[PDB]
Amino acid sequence: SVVGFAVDLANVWRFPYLCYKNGGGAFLIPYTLFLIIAGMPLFYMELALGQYNREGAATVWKICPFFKGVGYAVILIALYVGFYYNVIIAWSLYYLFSSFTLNLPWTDCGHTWNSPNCTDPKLLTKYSKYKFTPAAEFYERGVLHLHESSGIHDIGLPQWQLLLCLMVVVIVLYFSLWKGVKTSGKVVWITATLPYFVLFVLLVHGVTLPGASNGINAYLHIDFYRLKEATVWIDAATQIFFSLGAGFGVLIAFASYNKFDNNCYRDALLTSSINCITSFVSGFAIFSILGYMAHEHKVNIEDVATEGAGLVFILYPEAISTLSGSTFWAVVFFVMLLALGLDSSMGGMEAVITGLADDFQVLKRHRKLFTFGVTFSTFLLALFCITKGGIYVLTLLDTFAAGTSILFAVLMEAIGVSWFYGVDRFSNDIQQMMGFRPGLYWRLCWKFVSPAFLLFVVVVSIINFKPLTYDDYIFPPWANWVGWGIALSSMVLVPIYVIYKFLSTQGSLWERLAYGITPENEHHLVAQRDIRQFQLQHWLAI
Numbered sequence: 036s037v038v039g040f041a042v043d044l045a046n047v048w049r050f051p052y053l054c055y056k057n058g059g060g061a062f063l064i065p066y067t068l069f070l071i072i073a074g075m076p077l078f079y080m081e082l083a084l085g086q087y088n089r090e091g092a093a094t095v096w097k098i099c100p101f102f103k104g105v106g107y108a109v110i111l112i113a114l115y116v117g118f119y120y121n122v123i124i125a126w127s128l129y130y131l132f133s134s135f136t137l138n139l140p141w142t143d144c145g146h147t148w149n150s151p152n153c154t155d156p157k158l159l160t161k162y163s164k165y166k167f168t169p170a171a172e173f174y175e176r177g178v179l180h181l182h183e184s185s186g187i188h189d190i191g192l193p194q195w196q197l198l199l200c201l202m203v204v205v206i207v208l209y210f211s212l213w214k215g216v217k218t219s220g221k222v223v224w225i226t227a228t229l230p231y232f233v234l235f236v237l238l239v240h241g242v243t244l245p246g247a248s249n250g251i252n253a254y255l256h257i258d259f260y261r262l263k264e265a266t267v268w269i270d271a272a273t274q275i276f277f278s279l280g281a282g283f284g285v286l287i288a289f290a291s292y293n294k295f296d297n298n299c300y301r302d303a304l305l306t307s308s309i310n311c312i313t314s315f316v317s318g319f320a321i322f323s324i325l326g327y328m329a330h331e332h333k334v335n336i337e338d339v340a341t342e343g344a345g346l347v348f349i350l351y352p353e354a355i356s357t358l359s360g361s362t363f364w365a366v367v368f369f370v371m372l373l374a375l376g377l378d379s380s381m382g383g384m385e386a387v388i389t390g391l392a393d394d395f396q397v398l399k400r401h402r403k404l405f406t407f408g409v410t411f412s413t414f415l416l417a418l419f420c421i422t423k424g425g426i427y428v429l430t431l432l433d434t435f436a437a438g439t440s441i442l443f444a445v446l447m448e449a450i451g452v453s454w455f456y457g458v459d460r461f462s463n464d465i466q467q468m469m470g471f472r473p474g475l476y477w478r479l480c481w482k483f484v485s486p487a488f489l490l491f492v493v494v495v496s497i498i499n500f501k502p503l504t505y506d507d508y509i510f511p512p513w514a515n516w517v518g519w520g521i522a523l524s525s526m527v528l529v530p531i532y533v534i535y536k537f538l539s540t541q542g543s544l545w546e547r548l549a550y551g552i553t554p555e556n557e558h559h560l561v562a563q564r565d566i567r568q569f570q571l572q573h574w575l576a577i
């Protein structure tokens with residue numbers, strides 16, 4: 036009951052701006068449909084797969100040797116995403132160190148980082164973005180220094196203030212990873228108790244603000260022409276495969292340490308319900324503050340704030356300033372963000388390290404060296420996003436690191452398991468380790484329903500690709516080519532392993548094909564001609 040109530044950093048940071056970009060209310064229908072239909076069966080499947088085989092993401096594919104490329108690809112994606120989850124924690128630490136004063140920097144506009152185009156509503160061009168407010172100017176010119184960068188072709192040198200925070204973050208991550216595979220006994224009760232209090236207070240404060248009804252009536256309004264467009268569905272599926280965490284190797288790696296009696300069905304149901312409730316509450320709280328901000332600045336809701344990764348670092352500080360004793364609440368809130376980010380990064384590092392160490396057994400005798408290598412590589416690669424123009428690099432990464440790639444990996448996992456290993460064998464394994472057989476709904480969603488929706492989403496995300504933009508900035512085409520190369524770097528790993536394994540195995544075509552779809556512990560049945568996959572009754576099993 037401590038592994039289901041835990042909140043994830045994605046629901047707090049990434050969901051608010053994806054909901055605001057696709058409008059309120061119209062984003063929740065595809066989100067909920069995808070949530071149920073794909074996420075619940077796939078979350079349950081990933082929980083059940085690791086608990087039975089006692090293996091990591093890469094070594095779990097001893098039931099079908101042709102699908103180890105998927106395990107490699109999910110580990111590569113987890114490495115890619117950890118490159119830019121560190122910059123958010125650095126921003127949170129910088130914001131926390133700025134809150135130890137009685138005059139918050141984001142309240143007035145008379146500092147050294149202020150442009151002469153700044154107006155203060157308290158001390159007082161249609162479809163554009165408004166960025167002359169003290170909070171937006173603070174975020175863009177005191178922590179990012181974006182005004183010395185003209186584009187991704189001119190990014191400049193890293194900022195030392197953010198470098199000093201990234202160095203602390205990586206050191207903490209290393210020293211919380213170098214002695215064991217759990218190292219989590221302390222922080223399991225701060226990550227699941229504090230966010231609920233913070234959102235509960237902020238919800239009441241937002242709904243009592245003036246002009247928040249104009250934002251509530253915009254969150255409860257359902258736009259229908261905003262549907263029948265690929266962007267909302269592609270965003271919803273991707274956000275699901277960030278909020279639940281399937282497609283990164285974390286669930287398989289952490290389920291391999293459970294007890295062989297654990298009920299994964301209850302855990303999946305509880306996690307899905309809590310995720311849905313938290314997402315809805317976060318959207319309501321975000322739109323109340325959006326309505327208040329639109330009211331105070333005499334602008335429109337669609338033009339009051341940006342649609343990037345720094346939406347929370349502008350709205351949440353602005354809602355903090357309207358409370359009583361703002362310094363206490365800012366400290367609490369940024370502590371909550373720091374804890375959430377640290378937990379997410381620790382989970383990703385555990386996933387990567389366990390997946391890579393389960394395959395090569397020499398890395399199990401040198402854990403400090405491997406952890407140091409992973410952390411140092413992450414630091415070196417994250418140095419790119421703390422430059423003067425690092426927001427463009429971070430946007431490109433957040434767009435192309437887990438896009439079509441994660442959907443392809445999740446589709447391949449489901450197809451592989453449910454069609455080659457056998458939905459009947461996968462249901463007899465749950466029968467063995469839980470005492471009850473899953474049921475018709477799960478067996479149908481594992482084999483027919485989820486793969487079809489995933490294939491449709493994958494195809495549509497390629498057919499209707501949109502060029503990258505950041506607010507009013509338009510990337511050059513070679514940036515899109517670079518992003519597509521990064522996306523394909525993980526997707527290409529699957530067909531390569533099927534060729535390598537086929538060429539590495541000796542014998543005729545029949546023997547080479549049989550040895551790669553048969554579990555490694557049943558390889559003695561290949562010389563007796565007893566392969567179940569060469570029969571129609573194996574492919575007609577529902």
Ligand SMILES: *[C@@H]1O[C@H](CO)[C@@H](O)[C@H](O)[C@H]1NC(C)=O
Binds near residue numbers: 152
């Ligand atoms: C800032 O204000 C000045 C005043 O004329 C002018 O350059 C313009 O309105 C603003 N600049 C930008 C880049 O919007």
